[model samples]
Target: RPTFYRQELNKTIWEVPERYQNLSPVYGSVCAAFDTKTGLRVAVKKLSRPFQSIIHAKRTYRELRLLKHMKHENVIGLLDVFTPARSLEEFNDVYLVTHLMGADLNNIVKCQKLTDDHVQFLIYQILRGLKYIHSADIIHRDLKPSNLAVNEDCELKILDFGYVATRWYRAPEIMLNWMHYNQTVDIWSVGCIMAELLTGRTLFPGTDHIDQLKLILRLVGTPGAELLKKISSESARNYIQSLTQMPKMNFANVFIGANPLAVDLLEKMLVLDSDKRITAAQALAHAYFAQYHDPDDEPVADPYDQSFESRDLLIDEWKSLTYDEVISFVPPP
Candidate 1:
């Protein structure tokens, strides 16, 4: 019979089986272990100090809840979840297991030479995944290249459903602190990622929040008067009004040598107004994805219950919630 034992490496505790070999060094709260059972590799992600604060504990609970509920081909699958602790009192660390991908889009975009077909297929999968996520009335507020994992087959899966994304891929409304935003924020990120895949460079390389907005405006141009009025923050509205008007850059000129259809789709996704931005479902049907778009195959998910996210719970409460989730996968003695 296979045996499991606790091993401490680099201050992190792992309690996987002996069959799992070639354990990789910890990289940003995650490590790799090759599972001989399936002859495949898996990523073991530890939730660091998950109960450190209410906010931290909440985030952990949210991640676990979403991961367990969501099921899609384009979304990362939560293969397993475990903890070294046998009881709630000792439950300090939570580990999640998932299939290991070769690399993320961030590294691939930097090194690989993707063709137009590859770009189209990749973007199609993103929109397909977004369609399913939006159907659940959940916004993947953080959608960036680094958050997307890909394999050699060019198959991609969106990860990191947590509450944050890199500033460079943030939408204009988010930067301006809109009173309410919706799923369209993710469309803007798709536009940014699409641009990067096309040109092998970041579309908006912002150093800070202010600079990020400037870079976005430089390309998509400033929001018009009517759009500006929707902003809830007085300071944000004033800041935009003070800046000189910037004409929208022609997509053809900006993405030189790119396909016209691709540029057209990018323009629709990168709209300055969230209200005007093309939705994930709408984008999937555009001519840009004509070759691969199949409505019959595109899937949608049932709505997820987000009521728990609004509940203000203490750290212990959140911890108990998470502990219950971890035990759910365990078999009764």
Candidate 2:
């Protein structure tokens, strides 16, 4: 069991810092901050507190250890670690010191329209990162544009390994049984990310987990009998049941002017059967990136450079909705 504590103002919760964008609640967390002297940015994973059992602490610590071992370009890097007393302004909280910079892909997409090459590169890079994480026996569990990030160079970086279900792209198995998950969990989020990058919107955009599952079925089309083996779990099974009676939506049509190959890939990746679903390894091999030779040379010109628009990107939507309307169950300004 995990312990909870009152969130205190550990640092000056700035009204606004015009020098840098208020990158919090998305690119970073309200819990994280920067140290000007050491040029270090850190996220205080959670405020120091006692857990009902050591198990909670172990998982928190495992995040630190896993991040330490799996250092990759696509993965966020860990800079330092802080335990109680050793930490600044300690409140019995331990912390993970790391770079607090990196814009999320979903936020970036909201700012511009993705060209064919741009969407291709984003998906390819994400799949490459997913491949590495899966090969290491780690499950990202939660995969969403909000969790995926981009650097100044337009390079993609995945962030915040709460390790599952921040968004509705969750697999039916996981929904039915939280423990029934494996590497396939991350793929579901990746599939959602792919569709989002192209459409600048979410696939399922559900209000809650049930709606989230419904959104998945509504967009991807309904799952068949063989795919619903665990339909006995009514909580999870209801989604597929509702989806069967719900109208199925087309991918290409929703994303006006999207390429056919792109839509086809979305179909396979979002499939309910984990076995039949497109794996990240296979996603990278998909014709999506066949034309690319070098990752370094991929064109990264700003998609909005030609004309600025009034339409709100997902980033706008993120800020537009209250936190509860989005991911944070807590209220927002």
Can you write out model 1's per-residue Cα lDDT over 1-333, one digit (the tens) per residue? Answer: 346777776686777657677777643577788877678788878777889999999988988888887788898878878777868999898888778867788767666798999999999999999999999898888899888988888898988723124888888788767558788999999999999889887888888898889999888888788887777777777888889999989989999999899999999999988889999999999999999999998899976888997799999999999999888754221
lDDT of each: 0.84, 0.58
Strongest candidate by TM-score:
1
Worst 10-residue lDDT window for candidate 1 reads 159-168
Q: Which residue runs of candidate 2 sit more than 4 Å off their true CA positions?
A: 1-47, 50-53, 82-93, 161-165, 229-250, 293-333
1-333 per-residue lDDT for model 2 (tens digits): 122223325352322222222234422234455544355554544323322234444434345445555566677765544332322223233445456645677567667777889888788778777776776666777777777778766788766644124656767566556565668778777777777677766666767776776666666567676766745667466645654464556767876778888888887787767778877777776776787535443222111111112233343222222111112222111
RMSD of 2: 13.8
- Note the residue pairs that clash in candidate 1: none
Q: Once superposed on the true structure, which residue ranges of model 1 sit more than 4 Å away at CA?
A: 1-3, 17-19, 161-165, 330-333
* Model 1: lDDT of residue 123: 96
